[PDB]
Amino acid sequence: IGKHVKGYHYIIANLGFTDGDLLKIQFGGAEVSGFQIVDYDDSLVSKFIE
Amino acid sequence: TAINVGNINNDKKDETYRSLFQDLELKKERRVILDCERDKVNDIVDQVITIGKHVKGYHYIIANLGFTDGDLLKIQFGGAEVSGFQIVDYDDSLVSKFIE
């Protein structure tokens, strides 16, 4: 329906932001904010992901 | 505002396409004609949805004899007007006996 252009702004209310597919609205223009509890930038998770 | 969309590799396709509509944003272009092969249409249509240039305000013209031969249900609910051309009439009894 096209409600993700510049003007809308969504909030993802779960501790898993990067756990789902999120590239789909990566260029729509709308702003998206969420939460991550599993910081994939932390050193222990990087050795875990490998 | 004729733009040669032909010369593009598949590697940098997403970068030159957003840059093509940030160049179509200089003119605030809301009326576009495609006039391409049916394969290159669905690639253009897809990147359009991702940037959001299909809501109420845009109007595209598909210049090829295959309007319904591609997928149109994706840009059916955005709000923009889309036009095209069809030579195969699916309401004729000759094509019905062929489709059956």
Curated annotation (Swiss-Prot), chain B:
**What is the annotated localization of this protein?**
Cell membrane; Postsynaptic cell membrane; Postsynaptic density membrane
* Tissue/organ expression: Detected in forebrain. Detected in dendrites of neuronal cells. Expressed in the pyramidal cell layers of CA1 and CA3 and in the granule cell layer of the dentate gyrus.
- Give the record's PTM text: Palmitoylated. Depalmitoylated upon L-glutamate stimulation. Ubiquitinated by RNF167, leading to its degradation.
Gene induction? Down-regulated in the pyramidal cell layer of CA1 in the hippocampus by global ischemia.
Question: At which residues is glycosylation annotated?
Answer: E81
Q: What else is known?
A: The postsynaptic actions of L-glutamate are mediated by a variety of receptors that are named according to their selective agonists. This receptor binds AMPA (quisqualate) > L-glutamate > kainate.
What's the domain remark here?
Answer: The M4 transmembrane segment mediates tetramerization and is required for cell surface expression.
Q: According to its UniProt record, which protein family does this protein belong to?
A: Belongs to the glutamate-gated ion channel (TC 1.A.10.1) family. GRIA2 subfamily.
| Described purpose of this protein according to its UniProt entry | Ionotropic glutamate receptor that functions as a ligand-gated cation channel, gated by L-glutamate and glutamatergic agonists such as alpha-amino-3-hydroxy-5-methyl-4-isoxazolepropionic acid (AMPA), quisqualic acid, and kainic acid. L-glutamate acts as an excitatory neurotransmitter at many synapses in the central nervous system and plays an important role in fast excitatory synaptic transmission.
What quaternary arrangement does the UniProt entry report? Homotetramer or heterotetramer of pore-forming glutamate receptor subunits. Tetramers may be formed by the dimerization of dimers. May interact with MPP4. Forms a ternary complex with GRIP1 and CSPG4. Interacts with ATAD1 in an ATP-dependent manner. ATAD1-catalyzed ATP hydrolysis disrupts binding to ATAD1 and to GRIP1 and leads to AMPAR complex disassembly. Interacts with GRIP2. Interacts with GRIP1. Interacts with NSF via its C-terminus. Interacts with CACNG2, PICK1 and GRIP2. Interacts with GRIA1 and SYNDIG1. Part of a complex containing GRIA2, NSF and NAPA and/or NAPB.
Its recorded name reads Glutamate receptor 2
Q: What species was this sequence derived from?
A: Rattus norvegicus (Rat)
